Amino acid sequence: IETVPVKLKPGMDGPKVKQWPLTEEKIKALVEICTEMEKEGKISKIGPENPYNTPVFAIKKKSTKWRKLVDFRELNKRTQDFWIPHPAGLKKKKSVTVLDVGDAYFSVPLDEDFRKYTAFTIPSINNETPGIRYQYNVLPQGWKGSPAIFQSSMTKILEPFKKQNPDIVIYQYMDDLYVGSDLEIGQHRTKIEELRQHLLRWELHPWTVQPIVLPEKDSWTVNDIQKLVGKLNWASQIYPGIKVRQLSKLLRGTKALTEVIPLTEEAELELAENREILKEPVHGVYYDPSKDLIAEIQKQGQGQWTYQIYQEPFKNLKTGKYARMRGAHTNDVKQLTEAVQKITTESIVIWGKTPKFKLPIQKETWETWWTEYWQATWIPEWEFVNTPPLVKLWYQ
Amino acid sequence: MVPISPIETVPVKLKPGMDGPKVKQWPLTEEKIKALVEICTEMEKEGKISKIGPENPYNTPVFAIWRKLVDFRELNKRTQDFWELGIPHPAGLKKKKSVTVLDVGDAYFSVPLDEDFRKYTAFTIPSINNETPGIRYQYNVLPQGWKGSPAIFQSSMTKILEPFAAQNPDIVICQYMDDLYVGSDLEIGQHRTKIEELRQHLLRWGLTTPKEPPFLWMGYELHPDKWTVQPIVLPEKDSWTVNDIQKLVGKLNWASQIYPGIKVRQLSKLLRGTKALTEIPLTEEAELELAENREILKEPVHGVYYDPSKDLIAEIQKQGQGQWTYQIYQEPFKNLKTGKYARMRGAHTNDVKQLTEAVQKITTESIVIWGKTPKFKLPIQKETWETWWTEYWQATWIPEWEFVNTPPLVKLWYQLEKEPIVGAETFYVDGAANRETKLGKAGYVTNKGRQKVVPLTNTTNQKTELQAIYLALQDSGLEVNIVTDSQYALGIIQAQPDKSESELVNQIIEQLIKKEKVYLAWVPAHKGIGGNEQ
Numbered sequence: 036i037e038t039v040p041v042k043l044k045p046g047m048d049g050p051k052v053k054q055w056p057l058t059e060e061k062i063k064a065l066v067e068i069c070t071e072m073e074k075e076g077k078i079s080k081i082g083p084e085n086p087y088n089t090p091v092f093a094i095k096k097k098s099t100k101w102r103k104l105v106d107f108r109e110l111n112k113r114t115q116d117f118w119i120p121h122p123a124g125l126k127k128k129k130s131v132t133v134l135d136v137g138d139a140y141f142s143v144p145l146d147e148d149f150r151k152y153t154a155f156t157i158p159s160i161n162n163e164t165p166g167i168r169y170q171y172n173v174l175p176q177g178w179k180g181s182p183a184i185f186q187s188s189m190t191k192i193l194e195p196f197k198k199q200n201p202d203i204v205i206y207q208y209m210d211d212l213y214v215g216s217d218l219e220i221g222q223h224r225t226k227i228e229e230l231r232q233h234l235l236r237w238e239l240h241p242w243t244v245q246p247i248v249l250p251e252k253d254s255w256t257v258n259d260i261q262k263l264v265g266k267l268n269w270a271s272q273i274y275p276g277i278k279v280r281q282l283s284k285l286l287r288g289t290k291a292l293t294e295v296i297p298l299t300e301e302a303e304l305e306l307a308e309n310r311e312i313l314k315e316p317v318h319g320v321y322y323d324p325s326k327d328l329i330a331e332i333q334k335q336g337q338g339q340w341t342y343q344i345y346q347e348p349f350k351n352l353k354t355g356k357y358a359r360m361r362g363a364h365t366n367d368v369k370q371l372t373e374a375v376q377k378i379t380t381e382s383i384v385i386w387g388k389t390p391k392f393k394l395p396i397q398k399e400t401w402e403t404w405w406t407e408y409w410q411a412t413w414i415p416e417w418e419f420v421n422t423p424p425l426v427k428l429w430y431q
Numbered sequence: 432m433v434p435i436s437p438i439e440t441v442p443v444k445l446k447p448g449m450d451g452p453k454v455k456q457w458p459l460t461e462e463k464i465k466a467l468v469e470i471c472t473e474m475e476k477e478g479k480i481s482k483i484g485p486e487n488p489y490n491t492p493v494f495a496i497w498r499k500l501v502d503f504r505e506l507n508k509r510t511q512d513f514w515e516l517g518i519p520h521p522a523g524l525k526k527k528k529s530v531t532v533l534d535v536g537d538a539y540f541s542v543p544l545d546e547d548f549r550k551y552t553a554f555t556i557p558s559i560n561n562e563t564p565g566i567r568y569q570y571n572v573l574p575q576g577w578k579g580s581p582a583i584f585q586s587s588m589t590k591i592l593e594p595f596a597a598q599n600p601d602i603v604i605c606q607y608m609d610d611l612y613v614g615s616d617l618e619i620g621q622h623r624t625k626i627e628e629l630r631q632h633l634l635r636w637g638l639t640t641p642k643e644p645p646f647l648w649m650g651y652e653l654h655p656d657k658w659t660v661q662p663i664v665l666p667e668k669d670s671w672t673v674n675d676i677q678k679l680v681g682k683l684n685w686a687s688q689i690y691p692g693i694k695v696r697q698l699s700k701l702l703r704g705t706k707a708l709t710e711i712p713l714t715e716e717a718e719l720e721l722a723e724n725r726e727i728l729k730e731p732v733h734g735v736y737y738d739p740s741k742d743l744i745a746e747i748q749k750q751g752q753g754q755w756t757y758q759i760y761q762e763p764f765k766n767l768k769t770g771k772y773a774r775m776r777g778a779h780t781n782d783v784k785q786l787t788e789a790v791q792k793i794t795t796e797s798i799v800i801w802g803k804t805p806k807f808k809l810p811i812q813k814e815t816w817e818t819w820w821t822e823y824w825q826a827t828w829i830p831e832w833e834f835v836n837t838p839p840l841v842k843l844w845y846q847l848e849k850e851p852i853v854g855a856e857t858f859y860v861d862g863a864a865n866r867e868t869k870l871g872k873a874g875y876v877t878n879k880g881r882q883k884v885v886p887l888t889n890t891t892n893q894k895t896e897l898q899a900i901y902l903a904l905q906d907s908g909l910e911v912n913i914v915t916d917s918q919y920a921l922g923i924i925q926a927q928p929d930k931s932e933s934e935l936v937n938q939i940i941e942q943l944i945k946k947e948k949v950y951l952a953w954v955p956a957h958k959g960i961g962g963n964e965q
């Protein structure tokens with residue numbers, strides 16, 4: 036019931052970010068929600084002496100009820116660094132469930148001197164009236180300081196459960212609580228329900244770096260060997276002993292692409308050695324908590340997407356392939372949004388922080404539509420690659 | 432006296448490390464001095480300012496043009512930052528049976544200033560011949576030209592208008608600076624009654640109120656049933672300068688929101704990199720543009736107001752040379768507004784990408800104006816968009832739309848095969864160039880024995896790699912497989928441009944269009960892959 040003092044970083048003024056336009060239904064929903072929050076003392080209207088602003092929009096989570104989401108990215112990077120080792124056993128557990136404990140922050144009041152930095156604006160249509168300005172009087176969801184402050188309280192709330200079931204790992208990131216166990220799916224499901232009721236009083240299955248595979252054919256054409264040499268040449272940047280001279284010697288001459296070329300013994304030996312090399316993991320691949328994580332995403336088509344998480348080029352920490360088929364066949368942007376969310380979730384589970392995405396989409400398209408399919412409470416950083424990658428089929 | 436309702440002040444602080452401005456006073460003529468003395472005497476009698484003692488060390492200059500002109504320049508450089516941008520667009524306004532304009536008078540002086548900040552607004556009137564101490568004053572209300580006055584007045588006006596608006600949902604009030612615009616569908620007598628109730632409710636807080644259609648507002652003409660822009664004056668000068676071209680472009684851009692078909696590409700190209708106010712002839716294409724635009728601006732064009740019960744529609748047309756035009760309407764032949772989109776600065780592009788960018792722009796503009804995304808009518812077949820987005824390496828999306836058959840239609844001019852072609856000749860191409868002498872070669876070899884190598888001068892490695900592919904397209908049949916080692920050339924062709932700024936790329940595209948099936952494969956260079964005859 037006593038606020039903890041919070042300050043910003045030296046030489047950095049509060050956040051002043053442009054509020055982007057919203058549709059009429061989202062504006063209505065934000066008006067109603069913010070009115071209810073105002074009647075509960077969670078937020079309060081402010082005057083023009085507050086120059087700071089943080090973007091806010093409306094989302095529908097996994098259900099029909101609207102939800103208020105605030106893009107606290109600029110505030111988080113401007114909020115002072117606040118002073119827990121990442122539970123490396125969380126990614127080694129059989130099953131992990133994600134819970135939303137955002138309703139617990141709204142009990143702890145926020146520092147009086149810091150509230151002016153949490154200001155946000157509900158925009159109006161056609162600029163006919165000035166926006167509705169609010170500031171947070173309690174701990175705000177999405178702000179990185181909210182879990183850092185509530186850490187002590189949450190530690191107390193979960194102390195009995197942890198002693199009761201010491202095999203269950205509990206991690207916290209933003210407004211989300213990750214609960215892992217190696218129990219049977221049904222056993223862990225009921226146990227998660229037990230943790231839920233314990234919280235009321237006061238589906239993930241962790242995934243490797245997928246290997247590089249080469250086709251196995253009885254007869255190879257010129258085109259097959261050309262693609263093979265190109266894929267092995269690309270893989271030679273990642274693996275030391277990849278050689279393609281005996282396979283390139285088969286392509287000697289000017290033959291039609293559909294013509295079948297029989298493989299020689301040197302070529303099958305070289306190909307076999309390349310296979311054995313690829314079956315081994317990558318040499319000297321470590322994680323650096325002082326470096327950012329980079330996530331690249333490629334569109335393969337037919338709802339299939341590939342992704343690679345790394346820090347240094349050709350040193351992948353994680354690879355995967357997202358191919359969910361739930362109500363997104365027609366919209367590529369929706370699939371990309373859900374794919375970005377899943378990759379971010381896995382990154383939060385493994386390393387405890389979000390990566391920086393390189394999205395295969397024009398900036399204008401993404402900026403226009405990404406909020407329409409966003410269900411997460413956090414927001415990662417992203418950039419846009421407008422040059423087509425050639426390694427597209429080399430990860431497929 | 433009936434006491435007017437109290438208006439709570441807004442606390443103001445100066446920027447950190449700064450304090451109240453202490454600027455000396457400039458010499459003024461005796462006429463200016465007497466006028467400022469009389470003005471400040473009347474203002475002090477009205478309670479807007481107050482005589483101050485010498486303890487206050489902060490002062491700000493003041494001139495006279497009578498009208499007093501106090502300069503708060505350094506105080507604005509010392510005052511903190513405030514909130515508050517864009518103006519309401521007439522196409523988003525909703526048709527009302529009655530619309531009243533009320534201009535608040537003595538508006539800033541009606542709102543009090545923060546008492547702990549009045550000491551920093553002090554000014555000195557220079558006495559005659561400077562034989563006496565200058566008269567000293569401080570502002571007790573919002574000064575004219577101050578940084579914080581518009582925001583504080585806006586916030587106060589909102590807090591005052593809120594209860595009357597909540598009590599009268601049958602009227603809609605728009606608030607813009609020193610003006611209020613009240614619209615209602617009630618009867619004229621009930622409307623005027625609620626206007627009198629409004630100005631009485633404003634008079635309770637001490638706000639004085641008094642125009643009629645057509646309204647000349649922010650370069651617009653607002654009529655009861657229509658809206659348009661104020662007459663645009665396009666200057667006629669045989670000799671033009673860069674400042675002139677920029678002003679002409681801005682006027683044309685303004686008129687383009689209602690006048691369809693406005694093109695500014697040729698004139699915009701003239702001001703490329705000048706950055707100099709004084710400098711420009713008109714190319715034959717440009718003279719047409721200004722003459723086309725002069726023809727477009729010759730006839731009257733009016734827009735209508737927005738009806739929420741009707742669907743919102745936007746139709747797009749391709750103008751050529753990277754130019755696009757759109758009309759936003761609800762009923763046929765009655766536009767809410769119009770607009771245009773110019774392609775971004777790039778070396779390669781195609782129609783579908785530009786059409787997508789235009790859709791994104793119209794979508795954002797629509798969400799700003801009407802708060803909703805409109806249905807689109809696009810000159811592109813459903814099959815074309817289908818093939819495009821399914822084979823595009825980038826994720827792309829267009830909201831709900833339908834195909835309108837108004838040529839020119841956006842189409843896909845060529846499509847690369849996904850697999851090699853049986854029975855098609857295989858052209859292994861390659862090109863190289865010397866870095867010092869700028870000499871190079873480009874050629875091909877095929878499986879049937881067809882060969883060609885062409886000597887080239889004043890060329891680059893990339894130009895030769897493209898030239899080799901161009902040669903392979905020229906001498907091949909309707910179906911052809913092509914092998915290259917140029918990641919550059921493959922990267923260009925896989926972007927699928929229908930036009931380029933490079934003549935060689937354009938010729939390659941023209942060759943691609945004439946083909947039936949084309950398979951473009953890639954192999955690593957200098958790996959000893961046969962056929963790659965570097």
Ligand SMILES: N#Cc1ccc2c(Oc3ccc(F)cc3OCCn3ccc(=O)[nH]c3=O)cc(F)cc2c1
Nearest residue numbers: 519524525526527530603612613614646648654655
């Ligand atoms: N000077 C000036 C001026 C006058 C009215 C304005 C206005 O007016 C309106 C104010 C409130 C409202 F609900 C609806 C309005 O206009 C709806 C459309 N419209 C417009 C004019 C008319 O004569 N009849 C009509 O239907 C809205 C607005 F942004 C700016 C305005 C600026």
